[PDB]
Amino acid sequence: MTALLIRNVRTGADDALDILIEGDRIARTGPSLDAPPGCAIEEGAGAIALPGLVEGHTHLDKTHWGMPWYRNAVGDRIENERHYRATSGHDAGAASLALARAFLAAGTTRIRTHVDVDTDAGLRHLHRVLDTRETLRGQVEIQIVAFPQSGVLKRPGTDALLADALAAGADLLGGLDPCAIEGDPVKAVDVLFGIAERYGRGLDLHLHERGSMGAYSLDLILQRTAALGMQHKVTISHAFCLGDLAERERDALLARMAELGVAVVTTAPAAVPVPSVLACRAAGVTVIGGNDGVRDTWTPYGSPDMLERAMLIAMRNDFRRDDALEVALECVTHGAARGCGFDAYGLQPGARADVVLVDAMTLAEAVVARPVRRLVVSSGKIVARNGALV
Template sequence: MTNTTLITNVRTADGARVDVSIAGGRIAAIGPGLAREPGVHIEDGADALLLPGFVEGHTHLDKTNWGLRWYRNEVGPKLTDRIENERRWRAQSGHDAGAQSLALARAFMEAGTTRLRTHVDIDTDAGLRHLEGVLATRHALRDVFDMQIVAFPQSGLLGRPGTDALLDGALAAGADVLGALDPALIDGDPVASLDLTFSLAQRHQKPIDIHLHEPGEVGAFTLGLLLDRVAALGMQGQVVVSHAFCLGALPERERDALLARLADLRVALLTTAPPSVAVPSLKACLEHGVTLFGGNDGIRDTWTPYGSPDMLERAMLIAMRNGLRRDDDLALAFDCVSSVAARACGFEAYGLQAGARADLVLVDADTLAHAIVARPPRKLVVANGRVVARDGALVQ
């Protein structure tokens, strides 16, 4: 693709037939019948549906076994079983976070994802090794793939001395966001854990994305403590709570009170919409003005055999988990892996409008709802103005 390109004969989700002019990696214009200037490269969209590049809001590129031989999962049922099993297996197998994160990132791009937030384990056994591998992947794809890295203490913050110093080093080395994990049930002291997390984030002027698996009243208590700190420290709009399973199980009155606080403090929620546990309701979040976006979590790793780098599939799973069947409701699920996810993560210049980064996906589908449920091969994927995939395969 040249520096100036015109994609013709495509349809937007609202049914409009348009052309898209791309220059310097940005959308220069979008509308019907754009002029064919001399020397401009023409891509015939052949009546395809035009979508913005997809956004993966929460995954773990460093953990994946994507493309490797099948991992036989015999891990125990507890969260700590999975944590300990993974640490042991990665050390024994020599799992290469650099090679594996690159393989999965390329698979995401092939399927239409152009922006991604990945959590990377920071561990007292591995140090910053996994981070270094993912930083190398980000550098390798820097011209086309917009990646945020979360420094994530998978074993908790307080239980393994030295973790806070490693997180400090990870943020200094290039991680964009500070992660955290279950301050009550993993760290055992939610006050101390949250105080240290917020102190680290403020020291580096970084946002926070916390895994909160804690159920019911325990999770609600931790969430309340977190919101207290957001308010006291002026970190409105800088915190994401991933999973937030407690919000799917609380009585409606208590849930709604927390949703109101989340909205007021502009704290976003991330859901993977798993079928096996209670999850925050998309409709309830929308009614209260809470931002809820989507992601896969782990993909084909020692935790789970499931997951896919296709964000249309994740949109479908979010829709199914929330009982969405109408075409307009399916569009809400797509927002969770596109515009809402971009806003929640802070990805700039996103969307299908002049001036936005030229991240585009073309699919053979009648409508957006059709694309979500059928998940056809991507006819064309454009990232930062460049064609990166054609007919379901990477071109670079």
């Protein structure tokens, strides 16, 4: 069995310590640790040690990472994507693998990805991402959400396909906009929860609906979550309507989400209202950070650097204080892991030995400066140095 002693690192505002790793777990933390015989030594040189970063919401199947630049002349964005996939030979396999490897090189060791599951492609995108997940076993842990991007109710056979996706290895059921997309919100929520209940799985639902319509759909989702006892098994992604509502109605919904263990994903889009990270926090709602798309036919933006996403969340929420920047960093570390149900997380003994070293004086500096990951350790193995896989 292999041991790794990372000497002389800082977890933040605290004295420096060493981190002893054995197998895939953190074995010991503290100052001036003894070295087990034959243990490898890594000199941390006073760097900040971070737990493995977490991508709580992306779309690995859609990315053009590693491909030639996608020239965007979109006007109409759902029909553009479908035409691209039906006139190009896009391979969710090489793309998802390249992007997930870039995530790893930048210190992200846990990823929740949505994958399109629909009657245009069947399970083809799912199978490609499952291949990528198997290639990266022991290197990146990947949760897969089976996402009916173009809807369920109006597309015959989509319900059975989503069930097939869960049976084939998708971890979570996805879905979207029970009013705006599905047209029959009660039927849509009942169909989706029925499928997830059959496989005993959780759900992560895209909710773009604005204002009172979004609040209505959210209420329906939370009602069903409570009725089925699906505690800590439902995630709401985007949830823009929480930025539209009066504070009274907003906090009542957030209170219900906190009670049910429902987390919210924010990707901090700069041009639409977002849930206030501090309002969620004050209500007891866990906030998960995510990129959303990364260089696909929807968006040219996105990055495998989750420190950059933390920075963008902080900017979007008008954070300036150091402790507010640390709240944003929590959205791509402990908060994202808690919200997504990523277990054995952190830098304490017994946690999975995911360790990311960065040259920064403070956690707040690491958020805004995004220093290169000097070292990435994943499941106790050194996988990257100076931002590149070794």
